[PDB]
Design a protein around this ligand. Structure first.
Ligand SMILES: [Cl-]
Ligand SMILES: [Cl-]
Ligand SMILES: [Cl-]
Ligand SMILES: [Cl-]
Ligand SMILES: [Cl-]
Ligand SMILES: [Cl-]
Ligand SMILES: [Cl-]
Ligand SMILES: [K+]
Ligand SMILES: [Mg+2]
Ligand SMILES: [Mg+2]
Ligand SMILES: [Mg+2]
Ligand SMILES: [Mg+2]
Ligand SMILES: [Mg+2]
Ligand SMILES: [Mg+2]
Ligand SMILES: [Mg+2]
Ligand SMILES: [Mg+2]
Ligand SMILES: [Mg+2]
Ligand SMILES: [Mg+2]
Ligand SMILES: [Mg+2]
Ligand SMILES: [Mg+2]
Ligand SMILES: [Mg+2]
Ligand SMILES: [Mg+2]
Ligand SMILES: [Mg+2]
Ligand SMILES: [Mg+2]
Ligand SMILES: [Mg+2]
Ligand SMILES: [Mg+2]
Ligand SMILES: [Mg+2]
Ligand SMILES: [Mg+2]
Ligand SMILES: [Mg+2]
Ligand SMILES: [Mg+2]
Ligand code: NA
Ligand code: NA
Ligand code: NA
Ligand code: NA
Ligand code: NA
Ligand code: NA
Ligand code: NA
Ligand code: NA
Ligand code: NA
Ligand code: NA
Ligand code: NA
Ligand code: NA
Ligand code: NA
Ligand code: NA
Ligand code: NA
Ligand code: NA
Ligand code: NA
Ligand code: NA
Ligand code: NA
Ligand code: NA
Ligand code: NA
Ligand code: NA
Ligand code: NA
Ligand code: NA
Ligand code: NA
Ligand code: NA
Ligand code: NA
Ligand code: NA
Ligand SMILES: [Sr+2]
Ligand SMILES: [Sr+2]
Ligand SMILES: [Sr+2]
Ligand SMILES: [Sr+2]
Ligand SMILES: [Sr+2]
Ligand SMILES: [Sr+2]
Ligand SMILES: [Sr+2]
Ligand SMILES: [Sr+2]
Ligand SMILES: [Sr+2]
Ligand SMILES: [Sr+2]
Ligand SMILES: [Sr+2]
Ligand SMILES: [Sr+2]
Ligand SMILES: [Sr+2]
Ligand SMILES: [Sr+2]
Ligand SMILES: [Sr+2]
Ligand SMILES: [Sr+2]
Ligand SMILES: [Sr+2]
Ligand SMILES: [Sr+2]
Ligand SMILES: [Sr+2]
Ligand SMILES: [Sr+2]
Ligand SMILES: [Sr+2]
Ligand SMILES: [Sr+2]
Ligand SMILES: [Sr+2]
Ligand SMILES: [Sr+2]
Ligand SMILES: [Sr+2]
Ligand SMILES: [Sr+2]
Ligand SMILES: [Sr+2]
Lengths: 142, 337, 172, 160
RNA sequence: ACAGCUGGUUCCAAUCGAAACAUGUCGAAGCAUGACCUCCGCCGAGGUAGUCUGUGAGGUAGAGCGACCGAUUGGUCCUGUCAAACUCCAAACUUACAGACGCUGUUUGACGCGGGGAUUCCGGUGCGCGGGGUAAGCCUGUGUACCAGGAGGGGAACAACCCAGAGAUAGGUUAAGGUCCCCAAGUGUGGAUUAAGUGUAAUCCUCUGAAGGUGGUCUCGAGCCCUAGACAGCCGGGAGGUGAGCUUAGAAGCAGCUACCCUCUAAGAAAAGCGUAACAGCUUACCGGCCGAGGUUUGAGGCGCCCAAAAUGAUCGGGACUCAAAUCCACCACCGAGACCUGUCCGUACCACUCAUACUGGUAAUCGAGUAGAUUGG
RNA sequence: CUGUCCCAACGUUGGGCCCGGUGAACUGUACAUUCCAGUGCGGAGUCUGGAGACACCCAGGGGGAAGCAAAGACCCUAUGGA
RNA sequence: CGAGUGGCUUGCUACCUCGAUGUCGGUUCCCUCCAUCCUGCCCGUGCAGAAGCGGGCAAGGGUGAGGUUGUUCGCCUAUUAAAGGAGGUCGUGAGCUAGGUUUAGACCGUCGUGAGACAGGUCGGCUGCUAUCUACUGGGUGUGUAGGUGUCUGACAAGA
RNA sequence: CGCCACACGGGGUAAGAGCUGAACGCAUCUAAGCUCGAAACCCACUUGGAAAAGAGACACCGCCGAGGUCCCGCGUACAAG
């Protein structure tokens, strides 16, 4: 489905939380952001502990519910939601004008935001979002 | 320190509510091993009878001897595969692409569907082939319906429509096999997919029992001894502890029992035939007389008589196939008596 | 730091990002040498492993990258050969190579055959009571030979009495 | 009883025996060990066990750490070996226990403890150059049986 | 009926503003008399919350005891320890009086005196010093500031922790705290450390984490060895007199006893460790060679790791963060209260004028929070 | 001897459910769709942080409202009573 | 001898509740913890084998029936792979039970001049309520997405 | 109380067994890398699930007519619905 994006962001080799922090700030300023290649987005640290944290969130829940996403599609969306006052009017409008995607559905290349890019030649202790999703049990469709 | 005991009833068939479709819907299909073919069939439950059979298992001490085996008679007349649906591999899973229909429609099909008058089967076929060239074609399934009119004991003439997967060799060869079945009139029988002795998976919407208490619904105890005479007979002890201050959905409570979909695994097909051979004297109670294409399923089958059941080649068999068992006797004795 | 390794005349060395392909007469081996701030490049005739950092963790891996590259040189020229001998006390053991895997039958009197898959382009050759595992990739040969010794593992009974099994005799 | 109940200096100095009665005797057998007839200056090496934290060490803890320290020297250098160890601290602080709820709470006398400040030498050994590594192991066993962390400081010995 | 016991007791505003303590009490759920709050009248020039100096009082901390006293080691003077009810010593500090400076009072009358009215005598917390108790969100003192009766800003929430004491309205600048998003302000600068998501937790019932351990890693130093080739590895040599003597059937490097001697030489033990019934066998010492650059030993510091087990759903508030959005050392720029500055207005007090407490003009850096209660105008 | 129990089933009668008519009471500071943790006079639907949550209605068995009903019978206290 | 963790035992305190938060044991039904009894995979042995003994990972599942006793605990029997422990207001009385504790009747022993007492024993001895909110189990009606029929997809959710 | 049905196998790990391997010329299962390995984890399998607010997809019928409701005879359904 078509989405009139102002800013198209390439998450490839980029630190998730840092991209998320900027995307939320832009969404509140009225921008229509679209995070692309989220499966290839990165999160620094020891894989084993990162997965433990995300697996605990999948195990947590009850009758009221704690729906935690397994796909990198939704994991990124939830990370952005946590940086937004989503229950307020202004924050919900900001959130609904931000959409994360698997790959790139557009014709344009996404712009790599400043200070978010991770140098692979200087780092080995990190995980890709797709790698977390595969361990969580999500069906690989990318 | 108060003895341990497994909880009352399973939590895997939840929520225990009424089924959306009376027509069963398979959630899994067999692998692509052999030659191209339709991965399922459907029929209408008739009733039960026993059969005398010769033991087929080589590991059994009683090999060759006469064994009495219970059997459910299911009337399985030829169905019609009216169309071929194609799925595409989108980043959000499998989504339907297009459908290739026919010209030859069963007279009584307009009781469920809005029958196609103007369709383009060639352009739709091309769309599926471009998707195959692009390498984005998911799986190929056939829209199928039954002919309840061919069954005299079943009151309905309104066809039961369901989708069934085509599995087999390569994606190119099974696309063509699917199109061939459709183009004719879609007419196929139980013989085309199944052979006697094969293990099938039977799915059905169970016998409706309305609202029932925890004892019947979850298999909890009745109040014992002195506790049975105080004003509480078939009600559970407590709805939960003080803390958490809420009732958990895991505690056995009242509600809908029956009319749920169940998929009974590894059902041996004793015999497939056509005639009045499995019929009971005086007719099957609350059904009628069987004189046509049938199947004899070993043991029980979910749902009551007249209900539509579905077949699928076993996705998880334990034993190796022992084809065409020797049926020495079929009981024709009255189910009344 | 910087360490230069001269490639032998029999050898050809190429590079694709972090991957290094080393070719020769006994075959070809491709390895991925990735570590923070360590750049491994082919300077036409020599292989250079250099870094701007001199810390213990960086130095550890520079030394590891050296041995890995030098081993690929030996592998594509001379090759890697591990020698093995089969021993049995009561039951005649049948050690055979069936396709892409080495099978061990009637081990310690078992009815069920013990099997393990051969790693890479490694070749296991049987000569009655002696076995010789060989190939260009030390990782693949070292493991395939190890896998065979491990295949006859016994945890339930005393290993000193029940000594049956294939063992490594020669390590290169 | 655990040393958690007595390790800290939080009560006043309670040592005055002319006002305190029924005080249990010290479990400490000897204070001067080894060759007590010989002088301390007759030895080249002098190593002390320095207590890092200010504490109260019970007589039973003092005897356990003294016994396991000297017993190692008796094993490695012999029963009449050429060494002389000294425990310079004496258990002067009298300890109570309230063993009725909190009414008339003043405890009955249960034992004694030695008040040792931080940086102080609890044990001080005097040995020869060959027996310097045997005495470092005697103090390594001794520090495990008292409450604080310790330093094994070599005071008079540039033989390394 | 009485009750020292519970509950309730109705309009506005202005000024001041407690005590939860002492003595006595069949008193401890209550009173009385004091302390303390308030109002009125009198008196008429001093006053003393701070500091400095002078003249005095003092034995707590610390310390020490061949200075008393009582504890408490060992050796053939020397040597090892202590004290709430010890002291040859001895503070900081508290305190009496006076002088000086400061501040204050003489129309705002201080200091003080007399009289009327109370309330109060369940307190609590933080910090310092305590005493009891294993400990306690424990019990019981003391000094002090706060809550009670104290707003507003910060701390996720949160009486007493930080900023801050506050008339209304308005502009501005800061305080504590904070500047990646949620969220106002930095994805700031120079530099280093950490790989554990350690950590992102001032204080705390609340934020644990210990003894012990750590070739995890960073940094600083000391001794020794080294191109006359160090450290390690690998190769070669590790020889005879003789298989030492005694012991013994035997013991021949290697059961035990004693000695532990000298040739050859570049080394090679009367043998350091396995091995054999005893031999034999494999190695260590020691020497040579190949190789080629620092190596080895010890001391100290920083951050981390191990030690580390709990009950409905994990957490630094959350998101999440790794040359940081952590930590430590400096630095730069900002955000951020009702505080501070500033305009106008109000109340109250005082001054000038006045019959006035009606106007008008003036002063307040040294006026403006408040439960019980005293006083007063409406 | 037997359904007390293993271990529960089927049935019978009156209710229960729907319709006409009749028609109360208990209870109500307010707000109120909650759940998990935290915090707070240490036992929170309402405070903090998150999670979840479209509204209304029917039937149910009673987990919570430290549920409703009773100015605790127990304990101590009062210069109470009998 | 020294250092800790837990919050299951007991004790301490008196913060919360005296215009009442029903109480031991049991029962019934649900969730959980791991310091693991069995089952899976491992290391060591004073590991021949068989059978053990000790240790590690691990909480998916299981851990049952009975004789005395109100008992919890425990003692005992026969089975068993094993017949583990603990938290949830010592989970659970607007669920049950009333055997115990805990009134008013009575007896015995002990104590008391006596009325009477007992942290002794013994027989008997009462258990209210029509669910407003919330919570969950199942069942409907609407609105949203924006003409209809049929077929599906799968974010998430549950399972032993 | 009767009868029928309820895997195997993948993937990633723990404890553990190892390979290659350096810091530390040797050695070393670990520091980077890799092969294995639990009834436990994920998938497999069953059940629910367009109210998933990114509120979905496909095909055909239809917008003056497709379809639906009421009505009528009944149950494979059912306390009302
Ligand atoms: Cl959930
Ligand atoms: Cl919000
Ligand atoms: Cl890294
Ligand atoms: Cl019961
Ligand atoms: Cl003030
Ligand atoms: Cl994290
Ligand atoms: Cl007025
Ligand atoms: K109470
Ligand atoms: Mg019959
Ligand atoms: Mg019959
Ligand atoms: Mg007033
Ligand atoms: Mg006024
Ligand atoms: Mg002193
Ligand atoms: Mg008050
Ligand atoms: Mg901002
Ligand atoms: Mg942490
Ligand atoms: Mg209640
Ligand atoms: Mg009362
Ligand atoms: Mg009484
Ligand atoms: Mg009287
Ligand atoms: Mg464990
Ligand atoms: Mg054995
Ligand atoms: Mg469990
Ligand atoms: Mg109990
Ligand atoms: Mg209870
Ligand atoms: Mg209850
Ligand atoms: Mg009751
Ligand atoms: Mg009731
Ligand atoms: Mg009785
Ligand atoms: Mg009784
Ligand atoms: Na991160
Ligand atoms: Na979840
Ligand atoms: Na009743
Ligand atoms: Na007492
Ligand atoms: Na009275
Ligand atoms: Na009094
Ligand atoms: Na009183
Ligand atoms: Na003056
Ligand atoms: Na002091
Ligand atoms: Na008082
Ligand atoms: Na104040
Ligand atoms: Na605040
Ligand atoms: Na963390
Ligand atoms: Na007042
Ligand atoms: Na009956
Ligand atoms: Na009323
Ligand atoms: Na309830
Ligand atoms: Na009376
Ligand atoms: Na503890
Ligand atoms: Na307790
Ligand atoms: Na209670
Ligand atoms: Na009970
Ligand atoms: Na388990
Ligand atoms: Na019993
Ligand atoms: Na209760
Ligand atoms: Na009870
Ligand atoms: Na009751
Ligand atoms: Na596996
Ligand atoms: Sr910004
Ligand atoms: Sr289907
Ligand atoms: Sr499905
Ligand atoms: Sr009853
Ligand atoms: Sr609660
Ligand atoms: Sr104290
Ligand atoms: Sr210690
Ligand atoms: Sr004083
Ligand atoms: Sr920055
Ligand atoms: Sr920096
Ligand atoms: Sr608390
Ligand atoms: Sr430590
Ligand atoms: Sr005012
Ligand atoms: Sr005022
Ligand atoms: Sr004031
Ligand atoms: Sr009811
Ligand atoms: Sr554990
Ligand atoms: Sr076991
Ligand atoms: Sr019985
Ligand atoms: Sr007992
Ligand atoms: Sr219980
Ligand atoms: Sr009773
Ligand atoms: Sr009586
Ligand atoms: Sr009694
Ligand atoms: Sr709306
Ligand atoms: Sr491992
Ligand atoms: Sr929809």
């Amino acid at each position: 489905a078509e989405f009139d994006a102002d800013v198209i962001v390439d998450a490839r080799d980029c630190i998730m939380g840092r991209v998320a922090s900027q995307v939320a700030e832009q969404a509140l300023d009225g921008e229509t952001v679209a995070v692309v290649n989220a499966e290839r987005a990165v999160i620094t640290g020891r894989e084993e502990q990162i997965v433990e944290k995300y697996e605990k969130r999948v195990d947590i829940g009850n009758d009221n519910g704690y729906f935690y996403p397994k796909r990198p599609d939704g994991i990124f969306k939830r990370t952005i939601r946590g940086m937004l006052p989503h229950k307020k009017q202004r924050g919900r409008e900001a959130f609904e004008s931000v959409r994360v995607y698997l790959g790139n559905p557009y014709d344009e290349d996404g712009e790599v935001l400043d200070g978010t890019s991770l140098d692979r030649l200087s780092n080995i202790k990190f995980v890709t979002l797709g790698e977390i999703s595969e361990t969580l049990g999500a069906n690989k469709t990318w | 320190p108060q003895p341990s005991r497994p909880r009352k009833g399973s939590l895997g068939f939840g929520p225990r509510k009424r089924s959306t479709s009376e027509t069963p819907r398979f959630n899994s299909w067999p692998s692509d091993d052999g030659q191209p073919g339709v991965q399922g069939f459907a029929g209408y439950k008739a009733g039960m009878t026993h059969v005398v059979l010769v033991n087929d298992e080589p590991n059994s001490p009683r090999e060759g001897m006469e064994e009495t085996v219970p059997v459910t008679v299911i009337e399985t007349p030829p169905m019609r595969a009216v169309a071929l649906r194609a799925y595409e591999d989108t980043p959000y899973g499998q989504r339907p692409l297009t459908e290739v229909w026919t010209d030859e429609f069963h007279s009584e099909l307009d009781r469920t569907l809005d029958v196609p008058e103007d369709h383009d089967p060639d352009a739709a076929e091309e769309q599926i082939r471009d998707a195959h060239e692009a390498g984005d074609l998911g799986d190929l399934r056939l829209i199928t319906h039954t002919v309840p009119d061919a069954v005299p004991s079943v009151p309905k003439k309104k066809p039961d429509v369901m989708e069934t997967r085509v599995g087999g060799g390569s994606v190119s060869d099974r696309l063509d096999h699917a199109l061939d079945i459709v183009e004719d009139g879609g007419e196929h029988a139980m013989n085309d997919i199944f052979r006697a002795g094969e293990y099938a998976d039977v799915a059905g919407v169970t016998k409706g029992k309305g609202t029932q208490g925890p004892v019947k619904r979850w298999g909890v105890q009745k109040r014992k001894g002195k506790h049975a005479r105080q004003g509480w007979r078939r009600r559970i002890g407590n709805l939960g502890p003080w803390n958490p201050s809420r009732v958990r959905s895991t505690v056995p409570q009242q509600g809908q029992t029956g009319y749920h979909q169940r998929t009974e695994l590894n059902k041996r097909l004793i015999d497939i035939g056509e005639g009045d051979e499995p019929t009971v004297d005086g007719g099957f109670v609350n059904y009628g007389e069987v004189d046509g294409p049938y199947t004899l399923v070993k043991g029980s089958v979910p749902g009551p008589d007249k209900r539509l059941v579905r077949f699928r080649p076993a996705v998880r068999p334990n034993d190796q196939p022992r084809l065409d068992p020797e049926v020495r006797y079929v009981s024709n004795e009255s189910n009344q008596g | 730091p910087r360490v230069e390794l001269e490639i032998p005349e029999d050898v050809d060395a190429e590079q694709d990002h972090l991957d290094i392909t080393v070719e020769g007469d006994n075959g070809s081996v491709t390895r991925r040498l990735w570590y923070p701030d360590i750049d491994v490049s082919v300077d036409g005739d020599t292989v250079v492993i250099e870094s701007d950092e001199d810390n213990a963790k960086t130095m550890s891996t520079i030394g590891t990258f050296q041995s890995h590259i030098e081993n690929m040189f030996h592998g594509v020229t001379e090759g890697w050969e591990y020698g093995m001998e089969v021993f049995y006390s009561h039951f005649p053991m049948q050690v055979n190579v069936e396709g892409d895997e080495v099978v061990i039958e009637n081990f310690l009197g078992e009815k069920a055959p013990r099997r393990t898959t051969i790693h890479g382009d490694t070749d296991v050759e049987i000569d009655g009571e002696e076995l010789t595992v060989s190939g260009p990739d030390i990782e693949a040969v070292g493991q395939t030979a190890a896998d065979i010794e491990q295949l006859t593992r016994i945890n339930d009974k005393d290993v000193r009495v029940f000594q049956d099994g294939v063992y490594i005799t020669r390590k290169p | 009883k655990p040393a958690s109940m007595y390790r800290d200096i939080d009560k006043p100095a309670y040592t005055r025996r002319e006002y305190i009665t029924g005080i249990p005797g010290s479990k400490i057998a000897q204070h001067k060990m080894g060759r007590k007839q010989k002088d301390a200056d007759d030895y080249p090496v002098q190593i002390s066990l320095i207590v890092e934290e200010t504490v109260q060490l019970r007589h039973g803890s003092l005897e356990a750490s003294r016994l396991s320290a000297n017993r190692h020297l008796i094993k490695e250098l012999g029963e009449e070996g050429d060494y002389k160890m000294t425990l310079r601290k004496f258990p002067h602080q009298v300890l109570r226990e309230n063993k009725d709820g909190m009414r008339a709470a003043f405890g009955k006398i249960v034992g004694t403890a030695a008040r040792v400040q931080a940086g102080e030498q609890l044990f001080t050994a005097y040995c020869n150059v060959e027996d310097a590594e045997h005495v470092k192991e005697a103090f390594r066993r001794a520090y495990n049986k008292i409450t604080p962390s310790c330093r094994i400081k070599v005071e008079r010995g540039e033989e390394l």
